[PDB]
């Protein structure tokens, strides 16, 4: 019976491959052979947010486009004022081996998590005036790669146990568990409508999950190694991934297939982070060659280079007004570009 | 400034002070992974050091050997996340010399050749050597197929083969030891290896080597 089911699975995979080959009427590059390139976009360091004592592993902007939570391996989680380079908060973490952070859309909460398999949610606005741990969320068998808030009482985690989780923060229990990955999940991004999300997971496969229903809505393939970064175009109907195979790729959910590959023959190091510009015209990608590049998303050419980091760029993020972009690298420095 | 910026600025400065006050401590802290390929040996060895000291996910253990802050990390596939440990001073690799070791050798080879671990030294503990001595003395199948040193030896030729096998998968120094059944001293013998490691790092940083 196992052989019969394996044959059925192979037939279904062949059907999916044929279906995705059908809709590929023309490559995305061909429809873009008439768009004005954006040229060389030279962004300078308006602010250098220094203070982290070790490698910065994650970063997140506020919805006010001014506050910024950065998170480093020394066990600290610092909230900066991007405009004035002011440290608003310094939250000491209980586990230093932490590899993600998030900033609540309402601004009342931040999130973090890592090798302790716990997603810690911190309350920023308390009467007592200190940032205390609102909740430790437990249940993941592996390490935690990324966490994002849908709202103040629902969070989403991805973990290196082939599993994502939607948590009700008040109760503390997994409201939904998303399974289906084979390898360790590395990055997830939430749609603007906060009803869907996407996940990359070390098996060169990405998955679009429905938060409410809980089932794997769609899958995508094409990469060659670990998928280390993922994000949505700023409308929730496209998403770009970066991998250790030194190749960024732009996928679309409705087309359900690969659309572009951002790569260069001189790019041999992997991709640690990706984030889109507000209009979607710029995809800023962080790399392990110490640099961060800026691709004209619609033309797959390199619009710019955000050089300035002496170690590997681990995180980057474009604000909600698109004003700046922040890059954090393993040099313990965070930098605001505009 | 509107003075509500000024106070704001002052707040940031205070935070900076605290972070600076920790930088010096972070440098003073010495990190050692514990990679042992098993569960019983690691438990026994950590139990011995915990007896010496007292007199979840990652299990960080914090101790002091000679008034030096020490953190032993003690965390299938281990490729992307297993890169945050490039900041550690050493990797204490505990394997038993009385149970054969192709898997231990292969894991060692994967560990040592990683660019993550280029600036990280390795301390090869070969424990349960009393068990190895007994296994050699009492008639038992001795290591073969390359052991051109005589199987029924007392204690030395088998040990030399084991180590010369362990120093061969290298394309920072690789220390090694033959601690006894549990042990009598273990902290002062890892302290030496970490001190030599940091001395060589300092010598390289002074372009003096």
């Amino acid at each position: 019976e196992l052989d019969q089911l394996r044959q059925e699975a192979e037939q279904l995979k062949n059907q999916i491959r044929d279906a995705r080959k059908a809709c590929a009427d023309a490559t995305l590059s061909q429809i873009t052979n008439n768009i004005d390139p954006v040229g060389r976009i030279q962004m300078r360091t308006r602010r250098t947010l220094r203070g982290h004592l070790a490698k910065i592993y994650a970063m997140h902007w506020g919805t006010d486009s001014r506050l910024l939570v950065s998170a480093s391996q020394d066990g600290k989680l610092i909230i900066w004022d991007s405009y004035t380079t002011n440290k608003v908060h310094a939250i000491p973490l209980r586990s230093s081996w932490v590899m993600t952070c998030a900033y609540a859309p309402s601004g009342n909460y931040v999130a973090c998590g890592g090798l302790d398999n716990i997603c810690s949610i911190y309350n920023l606005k308390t009467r007592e005036g200190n940032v205390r741990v609102s909740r430790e969320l437990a249940g993941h068998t592996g390490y935690l790669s990324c966490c994002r808030f849908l709202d103040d009482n629902q969070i989403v985690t991805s973990s290196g146990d082939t599993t994502c989780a939607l948590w009700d923060i008040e109760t503390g229990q997994q409201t939904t568990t998303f399974t289906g990955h084979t390898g360790d999940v590395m990055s997830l991004s939430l749609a603007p409508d906060t009803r869907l999300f996407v996940s990359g997971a070390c098996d060169a496969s990405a998955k679009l999950w429905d938060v409410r229903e809980g089932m794997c809505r769609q899958t995508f393939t094409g990469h060659e190694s670990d998928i280390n970064a993922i994000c949505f175009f700023p409308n929730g109907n496209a998403f770009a991934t970066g991998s250790d195979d030194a190749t960024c790729r732009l996928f679309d959910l409705r087309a359900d297939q690969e659309l572009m590959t951002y790569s260069h023959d001189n790019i041999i190091c992997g991709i640690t982070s990706v984030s889109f510009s507000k209009s979607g015209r710029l995809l800023l990608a962080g790399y392990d060659d110490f640099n961060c590049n800026v691709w004209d998303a619609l033309k797959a050419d390199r619009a710019g280079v955000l050089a300035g980091h002496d170690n590997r760029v681990s995180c980057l993020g474009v604000t909600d007004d698109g004003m700046a972009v922040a890059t954090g690298s393993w040099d313990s420095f965070l930098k605001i570009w505009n | 400034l509107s003075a509500e910026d000024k106070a704001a600025v002052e707040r940031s400065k205070m935070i900076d002070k605290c972070l600076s006050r920790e930088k010096t401590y972070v440098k003073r802290l010495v990190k050692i992974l514990l990679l042992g390929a098993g569960e019983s040996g690691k438990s026994t060895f950590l139990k011995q050091m915990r007896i010496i000291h007292v007199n979840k996910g990652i299990h960080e253990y914090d101790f002091e050997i000679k008034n030096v802050p020490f953190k032993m990390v003690d965390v299938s596939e281990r490729k992307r996340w297993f890169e945050c440990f490039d900041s550690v001073t050493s990797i204490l690799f505990l394997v038993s010399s009385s149970e054969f070791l192709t898997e231990s050798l292969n894991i060692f080879e994967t560990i040592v050749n990683n660019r993550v671990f280029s600036n990280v030294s390795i301390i090869l503990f070969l424990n349960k050597t009393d068990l190895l001595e007994e296994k050699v003395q009492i008639v038992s199948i001795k290591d073969y197929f390359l052991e051109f040193e005589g199987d029924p030896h007392c204690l030395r030729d088998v040990q030399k083969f084991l180590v010369e096998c362990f120093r061969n998968k290298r394309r920072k120094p690789l220390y090694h030891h033959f601690t006894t059944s549990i042990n009598t001293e273990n902290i002062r013998l890892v302290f030496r290896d970490v001190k030599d490691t940091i001395l060589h790092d300092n010598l390289k940083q002074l372009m003096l080597q």
Partner: single-chain antibody, 231 residues
Framework: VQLVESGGGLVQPGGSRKLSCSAS????????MHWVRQAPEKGLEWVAY????????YYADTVKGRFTISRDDPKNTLFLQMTSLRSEDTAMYYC??????????????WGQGTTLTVSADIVMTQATSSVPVTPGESVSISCRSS???????????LYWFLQRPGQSPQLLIY???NLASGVPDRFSGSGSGTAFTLTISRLEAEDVGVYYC?????????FGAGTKLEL
């Protein structure tokens, strides 16, 4: 949160006194602290400010140098040391909590304070000392300033506080627009440089009392006479 102030009482002409505030239920070391006075039948007035880290210290120009401010963070106890107390110092003093970071809510908590009896700076006019109102009807209150408070950083630093009869003031409006925590959403207000009208839609009971308006644009912080909504 709880700021319990102690030390008040009656003093002879001259003399000295040491008022203190015990802080319980919050991170007192992270909070800047203020001393704010109020004459027995008059408006509020600012006395002093100590900052987080015991650094910045500002004084009221009226009695500056004659008193000092201090804090003891491990004991969470604030101090004001008054010296050479004349009759003009007869007021009820209140210890106020204010934290300064982006988006903070300065002057968010006030103690009950203690009485203390003895036997250029920006000016605000509280245009009216009283406004007769009927409960259930909307009310609006006027303060006029003698300088623009819209600083170049985009803020505006005027504050509205409410003293209900027999109580200590509670922050209604911080920074000329915003609303504090624990106050109903029916309170609001708007203005431009040197003019503001506070708005209370659906005036309920317990909203009787005096409304005060302050400038944290620079030092000193100046207070108006406060409008007394009556019912």
């Amino acid at each position: 949160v709880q700021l319990v102030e102690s030390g008040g009482g009656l003093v002879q002409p001259g003399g000295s006194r040491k008022l203190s505030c015990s802080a319980s239920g919050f991170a007192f070391s992270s909070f800047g602290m203020h001393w704010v006075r109020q004459a027995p039948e008059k408006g509020l007035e600012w006395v002093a400010y100590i900052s987080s880290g015991s650094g910045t210290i500002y004084y009221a120009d009226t009695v500056k140098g004659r008193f000092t401010i201090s804090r003891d963070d491990p004991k969470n106890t604030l101090f004001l040391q008054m010296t050479s107390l004349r009759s003009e110092d007869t007021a009820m003093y209140y210890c106020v909590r204010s934290i300064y970071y982006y988006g903070s809510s300065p002057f968010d908590f006030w103690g009950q304070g203690t009485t203390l009896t003895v036997s250029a700076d920006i000016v605000m006019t509280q245009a009216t000392s009283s406004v007769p109102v009927t409960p259930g009807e909307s009310v609006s209150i006027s303060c006029r300033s003698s300088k623009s408070l819209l600083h170049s950083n985009g803020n505006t630093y005027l504050y509205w506080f409410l003293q209900r009869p027999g109580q200590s003031p509670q922050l209604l409006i911080y920074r000329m627009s915003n609303l504090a925590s624990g106050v109903p959403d029916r309170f609001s207000g708007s203005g431009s440089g040197t003019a503001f009208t506070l708005t209370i839609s659906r005036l309920e009971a317990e909203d009787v009392g005096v409304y005060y308006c302050m400038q944290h644009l620079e030092y000193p912080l100046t207070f108006g006479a406060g409008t007394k909504l009556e019912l």
